[PDB]
């Protein structure tokens, strides 16, 4: 039903990219938003000339909203999605979908029972690099060894939700989502070993550093290392995504990529996350206005959630 009236829960990168396209597209209208922190809420309201709702609960219950975009504090995503679906809203999330596989399945069933969209993508984190990997995996043959490491030194560690044990949640959730979206080629994860180490702040509800490591064995033979570290103890940053195959190696350093085959080295064109967010937003608008089905289905985010549960279980986490 046009225009699609949108409320945005969140003010970060994913929320801003969605807001830009919702505004620009004539099939949609940005009505309200909610932010968790005072300064970023003010900036978002100014950029997009939309007034903020004081609570996200009020936003999702607004009768002048058709669609809720969720891209906020990690812990909140499942609860906000369930509340929005119960209020008869369509829901689009930036991954995570929920805290547990069971909640993700409960959300999937609820959206079906209400006949509402439940759509999840994972674009903000290395979305362009992921498509570049997809476009070039066919070139390197059987992938047997991959390493995805994100190390971000930060001193002092802030007292915000990203360093808060409960709000941030299991630290490997986002990284494991990235490594799990090649099931089409790697098969499913068959074995997991994972460790998680924290450096607590004086207030033990916050950590000042974390190092989480997951070592995965896939069914088609791939051994993958997935590393997530941030905080006060890290003196060298690292943003590496390397995949070794018997016909070549793909190396991504940040958003920079290079194909290596024999003695040749080729630059890899990495597209913008802005373009990927726009195509996804326009596909969502297509579905809501003409019923044309989305190419993405919830199964990819559900499996990433399963992998996260499995690695947390291997960690003794929660």
Author numbering: 8 to 325
Please give sentences taken from the publication describing this entry.
We determined the crystal structure of Syn BVR by the single isomorphous replacement method coupled with anomalous scattering method using an Au-derivative crystal. The structure of apo-Syn BVR was refined at 2.1 Å resolution to R and Rfree values of 0.200 and 0.239, respectively. The asymmetric unit contains two BVR molecules. Although the electron density for apo-Syn BVR was mostly of high quality and continuous, the densities for the N-terminal region (residues 1–8) and C-terminal region (residues 326–328) were poorly defined. Therefore, these residues were not included in the model. The overall topology of Syn BVR is nearly the same as those of the rat and human homologues, with two minor differences: Syn BVR has an additional short α-helix (α2) in the N-terminal domain, and has three additional β-strands in the C-terminal domain. Comparisons between the apo-form and the NADP+-bound form revealed small but significant structural rearrangements upon NADP+ binding: the N-terminal domain shifted ∼1.0 Å in order to expand the active site, and the loop between β5 and a part of helix α6 (residues 129–135) moved ∼2.0 Å away from the nicotinamide ring of the bound NADP+. Because of the steric hindrance configuration of the corresponding site in the apo-form would not able to bind NADP+; accordingly, these movements reflect an ‘induced fit' type of structural change. In the apo-form, the guanidine group of Arg185 in helix α8 formed a hydrogen bond with the carbonyl oxygen of His129 in the loop.
